[PDB]
Enzyme design. Structure first.
Site, mmCIF file in Angstrom:
data_model
loop_
_atom_site.group_PDB
_atom_site.id
_atom_site.type_symbol
_atom_site.label_atom_id
_atom_site.label_comp_id
_atom_site.label_asym_id
_atom_site.label_seq_id
_atom_site.Cartn_x
_atom_site.Cartn_y
_atom_site.Cartn_z
ATOM 1 N N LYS A 1 -10.398 -12.184 -0.902
ATOM 2 C CA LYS A 1 -10.939 -11.043 -0.188
ATOM 3 C C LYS A 1 -10.774 -9.848 -1.120
ATOM 4 O O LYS A 1 -9.651 -9.515 -1.516
ATOM 5 C CB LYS A 1 -10.166 -10.825 1.107
ATOM 6 C CG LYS A 1 -10.335 -9.461 1.726
ATOM 7 C CD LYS A 1 -11.772 -9.161 2.024
ATOM 8 C CE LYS A 1 -11.886 -7.794 2.657
ATOM 9 N NZ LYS A 1 -11.235 -6.689 1.874
ATOM 10 N N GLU B 1 2.791 -7.917 -3.391
ATOM 11 C CA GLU B 1 2.985 -6.962 -4.471
ATOM 12 C C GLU B 1 2.510 -5.677 -3.799
ATOM 13 O O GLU B 1 1.323 -5.504 -3.506
ATOM 14 C CB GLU B 1 2.165 -7.335 -5.705
ATOM 15 C CG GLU B 1 2.836 -6.952 -7.027
ATOM 16 C CD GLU B 1 3.355 -8.151 -7.835
ATOM 17 O OE1 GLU B 1 3.482 -9.275 -7.301
ATOM 18 O OE2 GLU B 1 3.636 -7.961 -9.035
ATOM 19 N N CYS C 1 0.557 1.499 -8.383
ATOM 20 C CA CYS C 1 1.731 1.266 -7.556
ATOM 21 C C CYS C 1 3.049 1.449 -8.305
ATOM 22 O O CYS C 1 4.084 1.734 -7.698
ATOM 23 C CB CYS C 1 1.654 -0.121 -6.914
ATOM 24 S SG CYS C 1 1.432 -1.450 -8.108
ATOM 25 N N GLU D 1 4.753 7.400 -1.322
ATOM 26 C CA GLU D 1 3.818 7.130 -2.409
ATOM 27 C C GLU D 1 2.538 7.951 -2.229
ATOM 28 O O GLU D 1 1.807 7.769 -1.257
ATOM 29 C CB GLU D 1 3.491 5.636 -2.451
ATOM 30 C CG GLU D 1 2.485 5.259 -3.510
ATOM 31 C CD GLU D 1 2.465 3.776 -3.800
ATOM 32 O OE1 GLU D 1 2.200 3.001 -2.858
ATOM 33 O OE2 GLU D 1 2.715 3.387 -4.969
#
Lengths: 493, 493, 493, 493
Positions: free
Chosen positions: A185, A261, A295, A392
């Site tokens: 996906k 992750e 990230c 973040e």
């Protein structure tokens, strides 16, 4: 770097299953926008559960005992991955341009960085295909015990929009090299490049059903994969928030293996003996790379008081000179943010910082009125309890903190729910060794940042991940171990 | 085998935290019964979330960077595990007796099997402590990349009542060998032996907080561990039903690493060329071992039509001769079921089988009026769609099915949500090799059953597990990988 | 440290074969002297070819397929090695005293250093026994390929007199752990301790013929082993000169596997940023440890000109305070040299240095008139072409050279036929990393010296060795790999 | 299989050093004959010591720290090997034709077998380049210990004439993948193909001096390599006789690392339950493959008496139908022997067999009067003491022995100074497992023969070898291990 086509043709925009392209069962399509202009590039088929279901079906058939793919020599699996790499390199200019058109990152980066790393990953895993041995074990008694390292089966792989081609490569490399089948996906923000590669997979000669790529939405096609009763393993790369949903979905249904992750808030620690020039530039890169949409970005730059003022002045200047503009322009360092939603999110954080009482040193606002461009912002005098120091941001917003002692920086740096990466800049052997060991992060870079190697594992320590994605480690999660203990007449050493 | 004390004294029945014994915060206690007489042995402290939190706090402290445990040499960890082993061997008679008193299994088995296996596990992992190396990786560019295999941190380990001491050893061995800290939840049905060993851990010299043993209930103390925000990893062994809860709990909270060793409905395939005598006895053992209370029991005995009648006749005779009785009697092959609840559950399945239309060949009822004894039952002419042929019975209830071809038996054997273990009895090399490869099971025994080696991994393929628990593989789940990439002046081969 | 027996009783002084002690076929015996007094301790049976031949026969028999040793579980091999360790630890005081009596090294060292390291080595390899797995290989075609790591067979092991017990342990640990059989040749200068341990091997329960220890002479018993047509592998530790003979002997006869641990002339590089105190003390230890009778001694101390003068001054002072005397006296740092021959050899080198035109800073002469004591000599202003700067002295004679650049020190340090070990003292990360890579040595210590770990391999890069002796690597040479390729009906992943 | 050129042009016939072609210093050249016609194909430069010396010089320079080859990314080494493979595949038809022209083997074999295996080997090792990691070791104390797997340096590689291109590939694959430099001596009987590949190495982009190929003679160029003072390692494949010389040479000079792949007299055991059809065909292949010129040939076919007579008659018939003739003819199964010398040697063995008193079942004489063709000979009723049953014949001469028991056949088969390979044909699982373990051979094939996989190691057990050549094991001998132990402030797990 070859001159790109600023408007590369979109040849594939459907659902790829048994090496065939078809529309969604619903015939629904969704738009893919160009972050630099805000205009729609084209429309892509919107896959959903029904499409996931059929893709899983296709994958399961491809994984049946006796299949061309299961009967195939491991070496041949390696051959196929190398063939795929070749096709990607043949179409490197096109893919780099399409990557940038759909994503926003500078063309030079997509070509020299993204595509090179894509080729290196697939090329790396191609060689692991016939080398991930099992074991012959000296068990007690008159027996012959050994292990088989078989494929885990049907793998659901959900990837983000920050490194479209690379993320795809990180998933397919280890999965295919180990003999698994894939139901992938791709991000609705950036589905174009993954689809083109899906056709190259066909051209490479991969058997039908081995790789199925489904463009669509998260809670739609993503969730269908995560909760499917016939997906043996899921690999997700995205937000921690959704990461939770993946694990919960796995538990509520199939008990399928899960690896994640996810997010980060990586500390970049500069010790007073660090080479200023290198430290400043690397610090800039650590956070600003890929529109800050990484990230493992060094979102918390801890600078030792003795050199704090100078480091700050230099970081602001470098931020001041960072060229933001048309991704296709040779001098553009920064492209736009992937989309309006992210554009607003980043801006929301800049607002928060200013309100939290942070020292805005570099303009924190939109850099244009057309695409989703934001000015490289730098906040000085940051405090640990500040939202921008905890959450973040995923945008070009730098945070610079001040510290005194190592004991202090270790505790501060480690005091986070995340633990994806960290960095230490110092000339001292003992500080380097001490810190790299004390830092609770999946990767610790010393005197460098964002150094990725297909041969070195990568992953998170806390709510930033589970499992590692590169190197030999990347093969573990795609392997199911079988022990076969046979009774022998008389065992001898 | 030394003469046991039919009534071994219970020395510890509290909560073990920092090498100290205390009552539950609530002062609540629960009874532990002896399955042979149905009488209460004594009462144990009932741990709950409050106690779990306290233990986690203790464990986290012991895991602090700079702690005696973290600073300890890997070799020393190995020495502590060997010392532990020695103390258990010193107390082997007592522990075998207490194991039987609280569990019900025959004393001879507890002594010669369970305790031997316990000693071998710890003794085995003691040697892995200083040998699970990291890697120095030939990464691209001028860098020095390498990995550190660090402990995962605070590990929550939940174990069942079937193999009290052994299950504990399977968890502690790899965990301790790797440098982790443990917060263990023991089965309320059999907490005694685990607590005794907890004190041996103290006596062996393990630093306080390194191993905390909490006796209590599942939805209480167990769930507290599974959803704890400071437990880095969970290792659960029990039912698939609860396994779901563990994975869901991990996702909804901490995103903690999870491994599960759960149910099974293992197929035992007898080919027409198999040595009858061996096959029949091994099939008996495969299913009846430990009161049938084994996750890997050969619950589905597929016998090739050509030898079916003979095999069935021999099976029933052997089941008819199986001596059920006082666990401490030298001639007792089968003791009672762990408790009334399991006693009723097994009986419920026998009822089911009779009603499903199964051929009851061996008496399917209680064997006594005092303890939880059930008669070794054997059902012939079983059909795949039958409850007892699909659901894990966990008792002395055998199922014997009939098949014709290999293609047929592979499909039938594999057609299950479980995949813990399987077995194949044949003299033919090609059938052995074909079948072991075709069977979707974590372990495939050929010409034997229930052969476990501390050096060979064990685990499930589907809803029967996730991860492997023995050998080198057992160390994987207890390791957190850190990649350290250092910039060097000039990299050379 | 327990009070030693200044005059330990010698219980064994014969040839050990099938767990039995006997005199040499010739009834010949040789004396073993005490280096401290120059007086004869006792006489030992002088083994020769006939005795080696008998031992080899005994070993071969013990290696027969079906032998108790070959049928023994790998874990049991581990158990035996641990048992052996325990017996050595039980007799620690005695063995330490006897070691000193026969060798000359200070009892404190023998006890706290030698014996501890012996225990650690055996205890370490005890754990490798059942962990050195083979592999299941994903070969092409319809096959099942795998490898067996079998023992190499009958191993001849020749050891020196510098670390009697330790060298014995370094050979036995890996050999026995892998299932091999041993025919050991011990140094005529110090056969006592090795013999006693041989009896402990018997007591530990090792099968007869598994370990045979033969005391005797080099060109006598040593050569007999090296040229034997029935010895599968030879492991020699001694002089490079003799190393040549071992390799030539192997080729001229059996083509048996060969591994050599030989001479050295290790460079110890002190960079100007090194911590003086530490560097000076470590430099002293680097060369003076064990009467300078260590193959990896820092024979060439290269010091950066900026700090040369000071370093030299400090070195001389430390050498001047080094206490030489009775090994049994708590304050003795240095005992005597092993024997008169070595005593004269070292003196010959001091003479050479003086004649070469070297600056004698510390008295270079005998330190007593009874034992083989020599004064800790230090030569300053050394030149690479000087004999004492090229040839291994193996005594308390320090060489201190001066250097300017790193490029220069690398070339100078590497400019040697040896490559056993090297050392680098610096606080700079880059220098450490650069030098450790550039130095052609089997071991490179950074900010320390003579740091040995049973878990880390040790060996030479040029005329100083072949193969590594510790860690996992130490098992490589004791393993013979067999590939078994089985035709399978249909191979699948 | 494409139509070959019966007379392929020879483009290279000189010495290849720094990617340059030159005549020998002597200007001497030697002829290379065509075994099928006995006519001279062309002349090749005759390398000697002086040429080896310059080649080693070039190699050493290429190995200097800081060299393009040493600084090159391991992944790039992998790229170069894959590039080389591509070039070989591009020229597959030419190389296969030239291989056959200079060697004599049928073109179909050279193409479908030799070149396929060549491509697969290089392609295999290309993936190993960046995966042979070192280790981070949990040593005792406050240190950070780790190992570096560096190249051994300058490797001398001496290869035979039986599989010219393949032997070259088996050597270059592991060497280059590890970062070593090569000085290769090719067989005077067949230097053509190796030289053409040498030029492809240049075309592939390998740095100069990395691979130097020297055509010439054994006692001349070969010996100069074996005793060279600057060659760090020697890899030799050939006769056991010369093998002795290589090992002795190494000891007499450099003490360089040595690996040997030498002769054989492999036993092919057919049990009474074996599938006759398969066993007979495989038995024929086992010995007759490549004109019987294979070191792993099943030189001793032991057949169980119960099936002896039938097996014998079937073998003779098969040998009688084996088509011997022009290698370029599609129907040719057997070409000529490499040269007149070998032609005479094989004939001498047939004479011997007849004289030893063996039953010549198939004509044992020349098959033509032009090339070096010999008739496929079969000797029945052989005895273990017969020369042809002891000495490697290396020709189309089959030996069929009779046996009764397993115990018997194991001892007989094992009773040889060689131990390269062995085979067992049986349908029984226990016999297969028992025999595979009992046979002292580097490779034991079960129900197959000559099955080679680039992924599985190959080597000899006694006077037939030292070290393994394929798979991960093939990398061991091309690696030098360096341990780096760094003092750290505070070691933690």
């Amino acid at each position: 770097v070859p001159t790109p086509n600023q408007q590369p043709e979109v040849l594939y925009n459907q659902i790829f299953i048994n090496n065939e392209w078809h529309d969604a069962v619903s015939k629904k399509t969704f738009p893919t926008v160009n972050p630099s202009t805000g205009d729609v590039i084209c429309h892509v088929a919107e896959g959903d559960k029904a499409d996931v279901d059929r893709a899983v079906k296709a994958a399961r058939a491809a994984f049946q005992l006796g299949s061309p793919w299961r009967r195939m020599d491991a070496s041949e699996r390696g051959r196929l991955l190398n063939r795929l790499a070749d096709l990607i390199e043949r179409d490197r200019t096109y893919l780099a341009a399409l990557e940038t058109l759909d994503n926003g990152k500078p063309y030079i980066i997509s070509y020299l960085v993204d595509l090179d790393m894509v080729l290196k990953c697939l090329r790396y895993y191609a060689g692991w295909a016939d080398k991930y041995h099992g074991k012959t074990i000296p068990i007690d008694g008159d027996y012959f015990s050994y292990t088989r390292h078989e494929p885990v089966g049907v793998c659901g792989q959900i990837i983000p929009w920050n490194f479209p081609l690379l993320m795809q490569a990180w998933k397919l490399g280890p999965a295919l090299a180990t003999g698994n089948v894939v139901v992938m996906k791709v991000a609705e923000q950036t589905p174009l490049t993954a689809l083109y590669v899906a056709n190259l997979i066909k051209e490479a000669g991969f058997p039908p059903g081995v790789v199925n790529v489904i463009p669509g939405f998260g809670p739609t096609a993503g969730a269908a994969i995560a909760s499917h009763e016939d997906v043996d393993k899921v690999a997700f790369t995205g937000s921690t928030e959704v990461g939770h949903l993946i694990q919960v979905a796995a538990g509520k249904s199939n008990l399928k293996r899960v690896t994640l992750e996810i997010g980060g808030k990586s500390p970049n620690i500069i010790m007073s003996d660090a080479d200023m020039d290198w430290a400043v530039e690397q610090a800039h890169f650590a956070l600003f790379f890929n529109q800050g949409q990484c990230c493992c970005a060094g979102s918390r730059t801890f600078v030792q008081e003795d050199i704090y003022a100078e480091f700050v002045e230099r970081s602001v200047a470098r931020a001041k000179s960072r060229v933001v503009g048309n991704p296709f322009d040779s001098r553009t360092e920064q492209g736009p943010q992937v989309d309006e939603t992210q554009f607003k999110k980043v801006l929301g954080y800049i607002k928060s910082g200013k309100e939290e009482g942070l020292k805005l040193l570099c303009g924190g606002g939109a850099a244009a009125d057309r695409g989703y461009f934001i000015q490289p912002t730098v906040f000085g005098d940051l405090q640990d309890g500040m939202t921008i120091a905890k959450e973040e941001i995923f945008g070009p917003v730098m945070q610079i903190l001040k510290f005194k002692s190592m004991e202090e920086v270790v505790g501060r740096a480690n005091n986070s729910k995340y633990g994806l990466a960290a960095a230490v800049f110092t000339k001292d052997l003992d500080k380097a060794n001490y810190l790299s060991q004390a830092l609770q992060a999946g990767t610790v870079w010393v005197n460098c940042y964002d150094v990725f190697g297909a041969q070195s594992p990568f992953g998170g320590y806390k709510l930033s991940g589970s499992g590692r994605e590169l190197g030999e480690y990347g093969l573990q999660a795609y392997t199911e171990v079988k022990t076969v203990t046979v009774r022998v007449p008389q065992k001898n050493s």
